[PDB]
RNA sequence: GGUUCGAAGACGAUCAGAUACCGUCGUAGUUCCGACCAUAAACGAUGCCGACCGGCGAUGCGGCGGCGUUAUUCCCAUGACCCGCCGGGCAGCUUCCGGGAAACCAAAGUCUUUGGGUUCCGGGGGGAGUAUGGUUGCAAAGCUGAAACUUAAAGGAAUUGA
């Protein structure tokens, strides 16, 4: 039950030197630990099982009906994730889906709709993510509208926090394996977009490994 | 990214490279903040301060990273202009 | 269409009009021979006279013999 | 049965139809 | 789908080549479609050269060679068992097998 | 055939922005293209440019900056009224916070926001954001 | 087909790496050492393990073994991996000067001081070997 | 690579480096290596600009000093030519070298016990160590590669044009890099050159070792 | 004019059952002149024009420059080399340019960030390119072209059991 810090950033988490989880996103460091997110955000981190997909690979000894669990993760106002893990038994499938969902978490981009007051609620600009035959055109919406879409991406946007968005589907959206990757890429490419507001250069700082590189090599092996 | 009051409503700001004048994505694992240690002109030893740079994944997958760092150091004033 | 013309209104209008004939769903409802073969001819309900009853077999595995009425 | 044989059988059948029309006219 | 990158022949932008009749069968094969072979061989097999070198009138008589340009089609080449189906990564290699002996 | 030269120029600078070039060289010296460059100079999306003028269509060297996503061409050029301008900017511009629709008038070439105050329409030129 | 098995190979390297000191080239020496340190159920397995240990000792006496991590060879590698030299190469007063770098070093802070000497340009004809 | 007025060079080591063979390039040419060409030489020889290699070496040494901890420096070697050279370089620096046998699972996977994280990596050859070029994209690790005119430039961070065929040309560049890193860190004073014959630091063929042992004994 | 080859057809076996595989023959065709029609996998299963977007070795044309060469050796420059540069034409290798369901393409990229100009054509599958309408032709056949009726399917890519 007690977590052991495998990575070098895990020792910094165990020593409480890095205070912000967005400093990991700033340096774009690869997260390969599952318990750090549960340590900081324990009660807010919620799980929702979307769909179990059985697939049958055919061998000479009949077939092996293995399951593919889709588990969405995250608080309703904050970070969300999408974990995909296929296994032959349901306990290992759900456990691997929860672990890969804790590893893969993304922030969503809230924006304003014309007038600037209060907290942002809608999608700031027209972005999309396409793969397979799924194209969800993210169009902004006024306040108090809702998500005019299918109920599963409506639930994903309720988990995201963007309460106001108009969608526009295109093609065969019944393929869930391409649909989940499309709705993951569409919310992943929100921050990766050149905007006229982002003209001032981002100030830099020392790497967190370089800042405490004298202490981490001496506090353990 | 202001609000009705005036405070920046965003909680983190992404990076932008100065060589290709392009922003850096969130999950860009090839992005490196390359540091250069400052060297005294009369002693030739370590001083204590550093000079930072930015490397994004697009320049690395295109194949111009060693030229982009060379041009950034040339613009900052380390590498000579002619080369 | 494919041509991004300026004075090309009536050409693409005639193309859309011929596409309206080439469409299958719009053409079938507006046939004269199909409306002649239709026993209603625009009617919703219709009366009739029963004269005999004929049994009809069903299809593959889910089988039955159901008695229809010749009207 | 191929498409070429179907075309040949329909060619013979249309020849028979032309013969019947020539005997009718 | 299209299996090969080309159409199984060396026809690039011409359209028609000279038809060459096959050696084993009488199949009318195109030139670039045909599998061509060029085999050189002495007329002696195991001991005919030794028998001629023992019993002859002339001294150190040179032997002729065989020069026959063979042609095979897709069926006849596999019936003579020359070409062989390879892996899909090895199909793209237009190189001949290595000439070592 | 090269009928709309401005469309090929916008496509060339669009591929230049997709690759990440620092400067671009174009062949004609069209006054509409020069005025469009001076319109973009006031917004500050690109850097300052120069021309090499021969006794033909002189060449233009534009030092581009990474402050532009896509500048598509409008072909053919339709008229824009005051009442229909909302329907133009609804499907043409992505967002309400950022977006510019350049259009020429009888007075001069100006953006969409100044034409709303002056209350005078004109034919559309393009869009850039 | 007297091939030493994986149950012998997983055991013998760990035994030598732990008790590298108490070993010997003789068979009867380490045959009784393996009886002390290890619990082997059968005489045939004991003799196979002891023969493979003597074969690994012959490999050690011949040269270095890639698989096992000997502490003595690790110390010998650590000596030549942490042997810091006294004075290394570069900063003599007289090293090479290149004429095309002479032009580009003139701009920034590598100016033409008194301690410079341009050399003659190197001879060369053509930079392509014939393709055959 | 800039803001120094201390190190200065005059004439003499042309006669040493022509016998060493660091000016020698490859046969073919990569299009990204066109700016590093100084001149040509007969029968398929490029002349690598050694004093531009000096500037790239100074930039790489600034990167080595900016990686302040000397323990977490990965010196990756592939062939038998650059084994004793990177061993003596690890002796001069105080880091952990990798002389061949890269194991997929030490840095990428989290099962094996050897789970380290050195920041700075030094690549001997890209076509040989194409597999350590993969983890530079997954993990944020700077890369100092040694490249030829025949070697391409893909998934690299900084490159140094050197000859990676001759043992003299490899051991010479390591033996010159080891002085620059130690003088830019600073332990030992800037006073004396080296007296001992340089045969110790180059990689030696076993037939040459047996021949020298027979000539000595 | 008809040498050779060789539809129809004969003979010999073949086959439980061969005017099928195969051989010996063999008519029309096979070759041209003066004509008729428009059919091929006329396939690259890929509409035309103009531009931007990596590199490499080489072939075929024209032009241009130069260490060392052969021929006329003996001045003179072109044939034959080698080293280069450009344009048009045909390919190949590598590739996180770019995209797709993949094969893969410097084009099949320059599409959701959707508008460069630009003619023709398809709307679940069959009937069916069938009737019927005329047009061209000595004949064969080509053109535009339905409907009643049936059909929850008919398909493309790419993997297993044998
Ligand atoms: Zn054949």
Author numbering:
A (entry chain DD): 58 to 278
B (entry chain WW): 1 to 83
C (entry chain YY): 2 to 72
D (entry chain n): 1 to 25
E (entry chain bb): 2 to 102
F (entry chain XX): 2 to 130
G (entry chain SS): 2 to 133
H (entry chain BB): 2 to 218
Sentences from the paper on this structure:
Type IV IRESs require two translocation events to place the first aminoacyl-tRNA in the P site making use of the intrinsic dynamic elements of the ribosome involved in canonical translocation.
Slow movements of the CrPV-IRES compared with canonical translocation of tRNAs are evident from this data and explain the capturing of a late-stage intermediate of translocation with eEF2 in our dataset. PKI is in an intermediate position between the P and E sites of the small subunit as well as the aminoacyl-tRNA is in an intermediate position between the A and P site of the 40S. At this stage, CrPV-IRES translocation should be coupled with the movement of the aminoacyl-tRNA occupying the A site, and this seems to happen with a conformation of the IRES similar to the one reported for the first translocation. However, a pronounced swiveling of the 40S head is in place, probably induced by the presence of eEF2.
